[PDB]
Amino acid sequence: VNTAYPTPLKTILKTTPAFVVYFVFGLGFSTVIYDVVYHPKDRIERFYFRSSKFERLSRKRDEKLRHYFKPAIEWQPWYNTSTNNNTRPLLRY
Amino acid sequence: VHGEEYAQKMQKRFHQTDIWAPFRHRYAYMYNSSNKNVKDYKQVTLSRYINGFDKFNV
Ligand SMILES: CCCCCCCCCCCCCCCCCC(=O)OC[C@H](COP(=O)([O-])OCC(O)COP(=O)([O-])OC[C@@H](COC(=O)CCCCCCCCCCCCCCCCC)OC(=O)CCCCCCCCCCCCCCCCC)OC(=O)CCCCCCCCCCCCCCCCC
Ligand SMILES: CCCCCCCCCCCCCCCCCC(=O)OC[C@H](COP(=O)([O-])OCC[N+](C)(C)C)OC(=O)CCCCCCCCCCCCCCCCC
């Protein structure tokens, strides 16, 4: 009872370890990318352009308020740095 | 300081006030006239790799 592999399958299996090593490296690369992009946001945030106009506005409202509105409304003549190293305009001209 | 009439003349911009035309140095084009990165360049670069820059709008 020689329960050996079929000849075609045995021939094919020779190159399998290369496939396994490729899968190891590819999973490592994909997981590294996933973790690098996941840690800062604590999630896989959808791309900005993959969203409706209203969704984009709602997403960026808080950032606009925290970065521009508050400094704009709390501005004082002596808050600006004398070195002209101020924040750039939101729409640069 | 120069005069109330002078200040009023400087501020007035349109004869007919039924139309609202906000002043803009330029008009947004990309991303359906929106801003993808409402941040500084340093924040834009770092926030893609460093935690704490995103404020979790929920
Ligand atoms: C000897 C004498 C002694 C010497 C001592 C030397 C000095 C020692 C250190 C001294 C100082 C210590 C200070 C400690 C206190 C301060 C710590 C601090 O500041 O951090 C806080 C800081 C923020 O605080 P926190 O928010 O509370 O942190 C919680 C998490 O961040 C919350 O995470 P999350 O829920 O948001 O999930 C995301 C998280 C979760 O992601 C993970 O980190 C989990 C693991 C992800 C997958 C890893 C797969 C690895 C294998 C892939 C296949 C490789 C095949 C090819 C290579 C051959 C392999 C045999 O990932 C990330 O955040 C992105 C990090 C990406 C890391 C890059 C990939 C790591 C592998 C590198 C491989 C390099 C090439 C191969 C080299 C081969 C050499 C032969 O934390 C971090 O940022 C953590 C970063 C972790 C990086 C990975 C570390 C290793 C993990 C285990 C795998 C090790 C593999 C080794 C292979 C060796 C082969 C031979
Ligand atoms: C013959 C020698 C062969 C050497 C083979 C080595 C191959 C290359 C391996 C590179 C990947 C190594 C990953 C190790 C873990 C890194 C963790 C980390 O940086 O924390 C991120 C974390 C991210 O955490 P975070 O994003 O929360 O940080 C922000 C934190 N707040 C918000 C509070 C500000 O960053 C920090 O911990 C901050 C301090 C970073 C300090 C600089 C780290 C540099 C690491 C260099 C490693 C070089 C290893 C050389 C080994 C040589 C051996 C001979």
Q: What HEC string does chain B produce?
A: CCCHHHHHHHHCCCCCCCCCCCCCCCCCCHHHHCCCCCCCHHHHHHCCCCCCCCCCCC
Ligand at shortest distance from the CA of A44: 1
- The answer to whether B38 contacts A60, with C-beta atoms less than 8 Å apart, is yes
CA A67 to chain centre: 22
Collect all residues of chain A within an 8 Å Cβ-Cβ radius of residue B50. 40
Q: How far apart are CA A83 and CA A77, in angstroms?
A: 14
Q: Which among B25, B23, B47 has a CA at the least distance from the CA of B36?
A: B47
* Cα(A34) to centroid(ligand 1), Å: 13
Are B35 and B28 in contact by the 8 Å Cβ rule? The answer is yes
Atom of ligand 2 nearest to the CA of A40: 26
Q: At A87, is the secondary structure helix, strand, or coil?
A: coil
Record the tokens describing residue B29, joined without a space.
């084009």
Q: How was this structure determined?
A: cryo-EM
Q: How far apart are CA A2 and CA A48, in angstroms?
A: 61
**What is A9-56 written as a DSSP string?**
HHHHGGGHHHHHHHHHHHHHHHHHHHHHHHTTTTS-PPPTTSS-HHHH
Ligand at shortest distance from the CA of B48: 2
Collect all residues of chain A within an 8 Å Cβ-Cβ radius of residue B25. 89, 91, 93
Cβ contacts of A63 within 8 Å, gap of 6 or more: B38, B39, B55
**CA distances (Å), origin A67, targets A36, A37, A52, B40:** 25, 23, 23, 9
Resolution, given in Å to one decimal, reads 2.8
Q: Which amino acid is at A81?
A: T
Decide: B52 in ligand 2 pocket, CB within 6 A. yes
Are B21 and B14 in contact by the 8 Å Cβ rule? The answer is yes
Decide: B50 in ligand 2 pocket, CB within 6 A. yes
Name the one residue in this structure whose structure tokens are 């009872």: A1
